[PDB]
């Protein structure tokens, strides 16, 4: 009655904090907005967060709900 | 009315505490008031026979450490889970 599972989707954080990125680089492939988009970060259609400018990855905690933003410092 | 002779713990952490309980003692601390907390080691048997009384948890105790006297009250005791012995005692100053 069992014996099935899907293929593993390889989500998670692809570039960590302080890690230098190019523009276009995917930072967190994820499933809802567990991590939100910050400065110079875009959120794709499947809530993939990608580097919209070059620089360094900056994980932060902002706002009244303590959300986890991801900025990019210009570098 | 209870006088509990103590020493000062020069060592702490789980290694030093478990070494200290195999030597038939147990650690304790005196905090409260405005002073710094005071890490204290206590003889085990005296305090165990002493706490068998009810007045140990109600009356003001006196702890003699380095020849001083600190009038404390027994705040909260960690006991060993399945043996009749003590892990640790919090004493609030009084």
């Amino acid at each position: 009655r069992n014996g099935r599972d899907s293929e593993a989707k390889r989500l998670g954080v692809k570039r960590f904090g302080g890690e230098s990125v190019l523009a276009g680089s995917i930072i967190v492939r994820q499933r809802g907005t567990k991590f939100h988009a910050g400065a110079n970060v875009g959120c794709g259609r499947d809530h993939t967060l990608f580097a919209k400018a070059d620089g360094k990855v900056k994980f932060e905690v902002k706002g009244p709900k303590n959300r986890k933003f991801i900025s990019i410092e210009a570098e | 009315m209870f006088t509990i002779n103590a020493e000062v713990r020069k060592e702490q952490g789980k290694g030093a505490s478990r070494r200290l309980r195999a030597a038939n003692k147990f650690p304790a601390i005196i905090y409260g008031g405005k002073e710094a907390p005071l890490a204290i080691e206590l003889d085990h048997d005296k305090v165990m026979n002493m706490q068998a009384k009810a007045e140990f948890y109600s009356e003001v105790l006196t702890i003699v450490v380095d020849g001083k006297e600190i009038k404390v009250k027994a705040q909260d005791v960690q006991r060993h889970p399945y043996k009749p012995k003590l892990q640790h005692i919090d004493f609030v100053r009084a």
Partner: protein, 136 residues
């Protein structure tokens, strides 16, 4: 026999039984039958021991069973190979660690609590001890 009225999943993994217990003081009553050995306790052993206690200190007193089974143990039948699924839920155990007060009792003298707890600790698989209600 004790068993949860309605689970959420029928079969549980084995898992392990490590570390010390949480229910450690005699909370509700005045005298307590506290575990020392590790082990696990089926619902039949809890019922057997409770009948030994309830008989022993007659219908006076008040007895609290502080542990509850809520863990299903599956067995495979006889002359069945390995594989071909997980077994079937046969009974229900509680996992015990050193420190659990398994039972409590109040409203008797201490000497009857000694007597009922001796009578009932011989129906359990774990080494057990007698404790009293200590005040802080």
């Amino acid at each position: 026999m004790l068993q949860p009225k309605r689970t959420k999943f029928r079969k549980m993994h084995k898992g392990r039984n490590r570390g010390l217990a949480q229910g450690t003081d005699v909370s509700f009553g005045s005298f307590g039958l506290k575990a020392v050995g590790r082990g696990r306790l089926t619902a039949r052993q809890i019922e057997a021991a409770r009948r030994a206690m309830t008989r022993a200190v007659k219908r006076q007193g008040k007895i609290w069973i502080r542990v509850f089974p809520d863990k299903p143990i599956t067995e495979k039948p006889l002359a069945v190979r390995m594989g071909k699924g997980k077994g079937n839920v046969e009974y229900w155990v509680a996992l015990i660690q050193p420190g659990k007060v398994l039972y409590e009792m109040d409203g008797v003298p201490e000497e009857l609590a000694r007597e009922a707890f001796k009578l009932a600790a011989a129906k359990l698989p774990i080494k057990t001890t007698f404790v009293t209600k200590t005040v802080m």
